[PDB]
Ligand binder design. Structure first.
Ligand SMILES: Cn1cc(Cl)c(C(=O)NC2CCCC2)n1
Length: 283
């Protein structure tokens, strides 16, 4: 079926939970043996969210190459994304090592450091220009260059220096600051505006390594971001945009990381975002 009318048909019939459970039943199951090794217990935020072995990002290190991060490679859309958990106190150096080694331009953050009165990820970037951060375990230095605070999101320019080689690179930090502690946003308008700002920066384009996107577990809000982006790109590329099947795209993405889209409300919000986004692209 088309999307917008499939949408109203699920609303009128109140069957979002049944649609979402079908997705969960059909999703891929692949091994995640490296994630479950005992030496990696303090590298995982949640015991039930792990990268598959076949798609995990490897650190360029011979001691321990493990990070909770997955490469989502979308062949028809010609887009790749790295989805990862929010960094932990003992993985902030690994996180920036990955950004460096994978040649990423942009980092997309969809959570606040504290939500619901608990810490959802480490404070992994500097908050003042004159107070830089040094990660001694991976030999990187990170400096805040500029910060632009808007009503729904903040964009930061960061300098990452590899202290072994003295090479430097500019990294863009795109921080969506207004996702509610509970539920999903009422309107997709600010989320779409944010997606378009990430696109306009070059961070999603083939001349750079894959964008790094995270929330707390790296599957819920993070899944919503890449699902909406890929569906809108496919609607622009194909002769028949009504052929784009968001459930099929989601199942394709779940070949590369488990659990993408965590609730039926996130599924409905993803439909809403793609539907409204497709009108603005043209109007
Ligand atoms: C971004 N984008 C480009 C196109 Cl084209 C569309 C789209 O969904 N078009 C629909 C019109 C009614 C049926 C298909 N979205």
């Amino acid at each position: 079926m088309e999307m917008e009318k499939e949408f109203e048909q699920i609303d009128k019939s109140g069957s979002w939970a049944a649609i979402y459970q079908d997705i969960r039943h059909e999703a891929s199951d692949f091994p995640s043996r490296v994630a479950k090794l005992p030496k990696n217990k303090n590298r995982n935020r949640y015991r039930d969210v792990s990268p598959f072995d076949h798609s995990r990002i490897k650190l360029h290190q011979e001691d321990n190459d493990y990070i909770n991060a997955s490469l989502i490679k979308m062949e028809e859309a010609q887009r790749s994304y790295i989805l990862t958990q929010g960094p932990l106190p003992n993985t902030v150096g690994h996180f920036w090592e990955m950004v460096w080694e994978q040649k990423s331009r942009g980092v997309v953050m969809l959570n606040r450091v504290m939500e619901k009165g608990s810490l959802k990820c480490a404070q992994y970037w500097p908050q003042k220009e004159e107070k830089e951060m040094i990660f001694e375990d991976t030999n990187l230095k990170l400096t805040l260059i500029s910060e632009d605070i808007k009503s729904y999101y903040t964009v930061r320019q960061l300098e990452l220096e590899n202290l072994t080689t003295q090479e430097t690179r500019e990294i863009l930090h795109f921080h969506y600051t207004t996702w509610p502690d509970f539920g999903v946003p009422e309107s997709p308008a600010s989320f779409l505006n944010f997606l378009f700002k990430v696109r306009e920066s070059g961070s999603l384009s083939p001349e750079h390594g894959p964008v790094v996107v995270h929330c707390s577990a790296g599957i819920g809000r993070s899944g919503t971001f890449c699902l909406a982006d890929t569906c809108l790109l496919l609607m622009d590329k194909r002769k028949d945009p009504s052929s784009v099947d968001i459930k099929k795209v989601l199942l394709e993405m779940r070949k590369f990381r488990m659990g993408l889209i965590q609730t039926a409300d996130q599924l409905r919000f993803s439909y809403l975002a793609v539907i409204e986004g497709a009108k603005f692209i043209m109007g």
